Amino acid sequence: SGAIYVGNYRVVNRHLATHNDWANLVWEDSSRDLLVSSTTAQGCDTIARCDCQTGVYYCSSRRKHYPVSFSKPSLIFVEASEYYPARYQSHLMLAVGHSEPGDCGGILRCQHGVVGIVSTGGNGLVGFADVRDLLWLD
């Protein structure tokens, strides 16, 4: 679990969005596994606007942060799950690092701010949904 809080927006994994997220919907994209809802309170986070390919992510299944080198956002095949059919997920970045189901929502950050959130993984890989191109979040 986890979310980004920036301005009057809350960014979450679309597959973990709540009834309240959907009732306050701003934008969603199944191909990216992202949903953004509106909030009444002002956020705590800053979004990176950069081309970093290294950073640090939070891994809830280890209660720890890990450094990672990650690929540029791209179209990657993701196997079927209970949440989605087999499909290509866009704007996804892969890295070698531990992840297991429950770690989705963990934040990836570089020196500039928040880069994205955990969205996929398995077998020593971790995938992050990029948010740096969503300029309107600011």
104 catalytically annotated: yes
Q: Half-sphere exposure (CA, 13 Å, Cβ side) for 31? A: 7
Q: Are 57 and 107 in contact (CB under 8 A)?
A: yes
Q: Is position 78 an interface residue for ligand A1B4A (rule: CB under 6 A)?
A: yes
User: Does 112 carry a binding-site annotation?
Assistant: yes
Q: How far is the CB of 28 from Zn ion (least distance, A)?
A: 25
Distance of CA 60 to the CA centre of its chain: 14
From first CA to last CA, the distance across the chain in angstroms is 23
Label residue 107 left, alpha or beta by phi (over 0 means left) and psi (-120 to 50 means alpha).
Answer: beta
Interaction pattern, residues 71-110, with Zn ion; x per rule: CB under 5 A: ---------------------------------------x
Identify which of residues 48 and 104 has a Cβ nearer to ligand A1B4A in the complex.
104
Q: Alpha-carbon distance 98 to 91, whole Å?
A: 20
119: which 2 tokens? 């969205």
| Interacting residues with ligand A1B4A between 7 and 66 (CB under 6 A) | 15, 33
Binding mask 23-52 for Zn ion (x = CB under 5 A): -------------------------x-x-x
Return residues touching ligand A1B4A (CB under 6 A).
15, 33, 78, 81, 83-84, 89, 99-101, 103-104, 119-122
